[PDB]
Write an enzyme that holds these catalytic residues in place. Structure first.
Site, PDB file in Angstrom:
ATOM      1  N   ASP A  82       1.599   8.077  -6.704  1.00 58.70           N
ATOM      2  CA  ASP A  82       0.910   9.715  -7.158  1.00 58.70           C
ATOM      3  C   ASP A  82       1.997  10.622  -6.979  1.00 58.70           C
ATOM      4  OD1 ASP A  82      -1.775   8.662  -7.185  1.00 58.70           O
ATOM      5  OD2 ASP A  82      -1.584   8.138  -4.889  1.00 58.70           O
ATOM      6  N   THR A  95       1.672   1.738  -4.014  1.00 56.09           N
ATOM      7  CA  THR A  95       0.620   2.472  -4.390  1.00 56.09           C
ATOM      8  C   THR A  95       0.600   3.919  -4.097  1.00 56.09           C
ATOM      9  OG1 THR A  95      -0.903   1.611  -2.680  1.00 56.09           O
ATOM     10  CG2 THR A  95      -0.837   0.420  -5.195  1.00 56.09           C
ATOM     11  N   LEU A  96       0.688   4.448  -2.785  1.00 52.34           N
ATOM     12  CA  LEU A  96       0.342   5.825  -2.568  1.00 52.34           C
ATOM     13  C   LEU A  96       1.509   6.529  -3.095  1.00 52.34           C
ATOM     14  CD1 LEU A  96      -0.706   8.005  -0.776  1.00 52.34           C
ATOM     15  CD2 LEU A  96       0.666   7.354   1.303  1.00 52.34           C
ATOM     16  N   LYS A 134      -9.666  18.783   4.667  1.00 50.38           N
ATOM     17  CA  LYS A 134      -8.492  19.263   4.243  1.00 50.38           C
ATOM     18  C   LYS A 134      -8.199  19.829   2.969  1.00 50.38           C
ATOM     19  CE  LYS A 134      -6.702  14.581   2.781  1.00 50.38           C
ATOM     20  NZ  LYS A 134      -6.255  14.810   1.501  1.00 50.38           N
ATOM     21  N   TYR A 181       0.723  -1.187   0.053  1.00 52.93           N
ATOM     22  CA  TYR A 181      -0.132   0.094  -0.150  1.00 52.93           C
ATOM     23  C   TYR A 181       0.968   1.426  -0.045  1.00 52.93           C
ATOM     24  CZ  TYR A 181      -4.293  -2.646   0.408  1.00 52.93           C
ATOM     25  OH  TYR A 181      -5.381  -3.539   0.128  1.00 52.93           O
ATOM     26  N   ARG A 223      -2.531  14.273   8.943  1.00 52.98           N
ATOM     27  CA  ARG A 223      -2.789  14.578   7.785  1.00 52.98           C
ATOM     28  C   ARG A 223      -4.230  15.078   7.236  1.00 52.98           C
ATOM     29  NH1 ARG A 223      -0.488  11.687   4.115  1.00 52.98           N
ATOM     30  NH2 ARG A 223      -1.926  11.838   2.340  1.00 52.98           N
ATOM     31  N   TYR A 224      -5.226  14.593   8.199  1.00 54.65           N
ATOM     32  CA  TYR A 224      -6.593  14.973   7.687  1.00 54.65           C
ATOM     33  C   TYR A 224      -6.920  16.304   8.520  1.00 54.65           C
ATOM     34  CZ  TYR A 224      -6.718  10.336   5.383  1.00 54.65           C
ATOM     35  OH  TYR A 224      -6.440   9.477   4.398  1.00 54.65           O
ATOM     36  N   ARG A 267     -13.176   7.239  -9.244  1.00 56.01           N
ATOM     37  CA  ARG A 267     -13.090   7.122  -8.156  1.00 56.01           C
ATOM     38  C   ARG A 267     -12.758   5.535  -7.729  1.00 56.01           C
ATOM     39  NH1 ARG A 267     -10.109   7.756  -3.627  1.00 56.01           N
ATOM     40  NH2 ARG A 267     -11.365   7.833  -1.713  1.00 56.01           N
TER      41      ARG A 267
END
Ligand SMILES: CC[N+](CC)(CC)Cc1ccccc1
Ligand SMILES: [Mg+2]
Ligand SMILES: [Mg+2]
Ligand SMILES: [Mg+2]
Lengths: 352, 352
Positions: free
Chosen positions: B98, B94-95, B230, B91, B302-303, B180
């Site tokens: 971006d 994948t992140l 955010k 994971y 982060r949020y 999405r």
């Protein structure tokens, strides 16, 4: 107890609304393509390796090859001849699986390891499809190819899931479309509509992506509708979007049908809104596919909608009057004799 | 601008529905797992091959790996330590994609052929991800593995599309869900919640399949919802599910938000509604995932949801206090200093 009647109330709104009117091709062109496509595919599926690995009753292989060549040719009216043929091989493979049983599990256990190492897949289907794929992919740029690959892969899962004839736990509202999307080859059809010899993936990236997203639902719902008949009292076709809408969403086969229609109608409305002012060439292909696609549904044996023209050719309703009016246009343009293109039989080629 | 009151209401409702409550996951255990996963991963990404083939600024990699380990450990509460570790690596990959702005076209040109041939992929992200995948798939059965393989692939395409900063053609209503879904990693998440050492796909096929189907939408909409704070003023991120609804559907930002909330709440309700009576062991994995997921959103800086708590910690409204209740609950179990588990930094492991 096929609802009938209402079937017309549906079909008619769609056809009348999309202003159904197959105008692509000329009888003298249509046959040129049906024969070209059938010829290559039939020679392919007649080779020993194909013959020995694809487990299909000769008769069904033949009927499928014909329904597929018919579909490719009538809907992909703007692609090259070679392209139709190769697409016809790819789609004939998927149709074999769509109608078959057999458990994938045992042969899918080392899928990713054999893949990453370059070793023929345990599953015979994967072995033949992955070997042939390159002849389909050559017609496309990289992006459209990714779409074709993924979709074919998803479709493989869908057929697997389908082999449990499960319509979803009541209240699993998501399940229905989840499953339909997985087996509708949406992104595979939408992407294969743009050969690189005729389109530039990078120049029309946005329109092509939008076409894939929108055409996925149109393409599948139109089939969910048109083939509601043939998939009624048949096993394997027992699990359909409409039928799972009922189970999962907890409603009546009457409402679920209205649902599918209200959707299909909207998809159609947006197809036009979105692609009218855009690149004429794009619109042209979308346009041809949409009309050609319906022509094929009203003409191929598989969907046997003849058993409805000859079951309402009497009932004088302002509804079944439009249905029959339509069914007529269709056959008038797309009703052809297999004796003019589908020859010789795949089997006859095999024993040579 | 900013529906601070409306957001609060929706957040409390969602938390209520899913029964957001007291986990049996002890803070001492959370730390055992946080360090185990972080450690195996940091050691992985610190390898030289990894170090030279993965283009990511060291500080963002460090941060990304941390956000992920947190997300996994807090949500895959019932899987083994190795499982959390390996999923944490996949994971994080994948992140990290971006951050790549590079055109996939040139490297994707021979995607299928190298694949079928067993030759290392051109695009480095693929080379690393496909080489590491076995390390992940070994935890699952064939069905579940196919799902992961597919989502990751769909994920790759979504990144590709997202590189165009395109929110959809006005009227292209099917685009937001399409996108999405393309990069949501849904079927990956859903299918990775059932390790073979704890479950048997064959015996729990319908339960699992159904989870994948519903979890895909739940997990993506809940993330879109928490992230709505955010991203509100983030002029950088132009294409978000909601911002796309605005453009594609042609509605007010508020109407779109209204759309997400309805889907999110309804999706939550049906979750429980469908899995309460199902196998206890399964509902536990589901029940826990939903909770830690939220716990993680409430706890990951982060949020910046703490900014909200700091703005409603005193209002005497039912929603405002309910919110804080849940927050302090989450903080209680989830707020853990990185110093307690994330060490040493990946950068330091790389020079060793
Ligand atoms: C190509 C997609 N199709 C066309 C009728 C609609 C979803 C189903 C199909 C699946 C497999 C083989 C042939 C057709
Ligand atoms: Mg099918
Ligand atoms: Mg079928
Ligand atoms: Mg159908």
């Amino acid at each position: 107890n096929f609802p009938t009647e209402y079937f017309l109330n549906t079909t008619v709104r769609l056809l009348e609304y999309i202003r159904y009117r197959d105008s692509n091709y000329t009888r003298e062109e249509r046959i040129e393509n049906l024969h070209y496509a059938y010829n290559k595919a039939a020679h392919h599926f007649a080779q020993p390796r194909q013959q020995q690995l694809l487990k299909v009753d000769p008769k069904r292989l033949q009927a499928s090859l014909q329904t597929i060549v018919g579909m490719v040719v009538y809907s992909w009216a703007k692609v090259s001849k070679e392209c139709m043929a190769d697409l016809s091989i790819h789609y004939t493979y998927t149709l074999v699986l769509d109608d078959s049983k057999d458990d994938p599990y045992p042969t899918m256990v080392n899928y990713f390891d054999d893949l990453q190492a370059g070793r023929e897949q345990a599953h015979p289907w994967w072995a033949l499809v992955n070997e042939h794929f390159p002849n389909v992919l050559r017609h496309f740029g990289p992006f459209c190819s990714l779409n074709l690959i993924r979709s074919t892969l998803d479709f493989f899962e869908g057929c697997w899931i389908e082999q449990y004839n499960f319509g979803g736990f009541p209240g699993s509202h998501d399940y229905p479309q989840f499953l339909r999307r997985m087996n509708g080859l949406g992104h595979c059809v939408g992407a294969s509509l743009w050969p690189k010899e005729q389109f530039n993936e990078r120049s029309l990236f946005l329109e092509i992506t939008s076409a894939i997203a929108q055409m996925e639902n149109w393409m599948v719902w139109v089939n969910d509708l048109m083939s509601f008949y043939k998939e009624f009292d048949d096993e394997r076709d027992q699990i359909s979007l409409v039928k799972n809408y009922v189970v999962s969403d907890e409603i009546s086969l009457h409402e679920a049908l209205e649902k599918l229609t209200q959707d299909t109608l909207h998809s159609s409305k947006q197809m036009v809104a979105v692609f009218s002012d855009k690149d004429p060439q794009v619109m042209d292909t979308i346009e041809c596919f949409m009309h050609g696609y319906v022509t094929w549904h009203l003409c191929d044996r598989r969907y046997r909608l003849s058993e409805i023209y000859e079951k309402v050719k009497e009932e004088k309703t302002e509804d079944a009057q439009k249905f029959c009016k339509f069914y007529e246009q269709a056959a008038n343009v797309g009703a052809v004799s297999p004796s003019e293109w589908a020859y010789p039989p795949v089997a006859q080629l095999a024993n040579v």
